[PDB]
Backbone as ProteinMPNN parsed JSONL, in Angstrom:
{"seq_chain_A": "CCRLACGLGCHPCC", "coords_chain_A": {"N_chain_A": [[-222.52, -196.903, 158.234], [-220.845, -194.898, 156.09], [-220.894, -191.617, 154.594], [-219.219, -189.54, 153.217], [-216.792, -190.406, 153.905], [-217.031, -192.862, 153.081], [-215.368, -193.883, 151.315], [-213.066, -194.476, 152.451], [-212.377, -197.252, 152.923], [-214.863, -197.931, 153.768], [-217.747, -199.296, 152.806], [-220.903, -200.628, 151.445], [-221.596, -197.076, 150.422], [-223.896, -194.748, 152.036]], "CA_chain_A": [[-222.264, -196.642, 156.991], [-220.375, -193.567, 155.922], [-221.406, -190.832, 153.406], [-218.066, -189.044, 152.519], [-215.7, -191.206, 154.36], [-217.213, -194.167, 152.581], [-214.23, -194.142, 150.289], [-212.058, -194.84, 153.229], [-212.626, -198.371, 153.436], [-216.231, -198.009, 154.293], [-218.686, -199.371, 151.957], [-221.226, -199.497, 150.485], [-221.915, -195.861, 151.129], [-225.241, -194.481, 152.29]], "C_chain_A": [[-221.756, -195.165, 156.836], [-220.816, -192.775, 154.478], [-220.146, -190.304, 152.646], [-216.944, -189.929, 152.713], [-215.953, -192.738, 153.788], [-216.072, -194.83, 151.84], [-212.988, -194.565, 151.125], [-212.251, -196.261, 153.892], [-214.03, -198.816, 154.114], [-217.403, -198.032, 153.202], [-219.632, -200.628, 152.17], [-221.529, -198.156, 151.187], [-223.477, -195.622, 151.057], [-225.763, -193.197, 151.577]], "O_chain_A": [[-222.311, -194.285, 157.494], [-221.026, -193.386, 153.43], [-220.03, -190.625, 151.463], [-216.189, -190.2, 151.78], [-215.172, -193.66, 154.026], [-215.873, -196.043, 151.766], [-211.975, -194.968, 150.553], [-212.283, -196.442, 155.109], [-214.22, -199.811, 154.814], [-217.928, -197.002, 152.778], [-219.29, -201.546, 152.915], [-221.696, -198.118, 152.406], [-224.204, -196.16, 150.222], [-226.935, -192.846, 151.716]]}, "name": "protein", "num_of_chains": 1, "seq": "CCRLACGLGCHPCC"}
């Protein structure tokens, strides 16, 4: 999971 990069096709965010 990604925190800030979660918006780059990486969800859900942690």
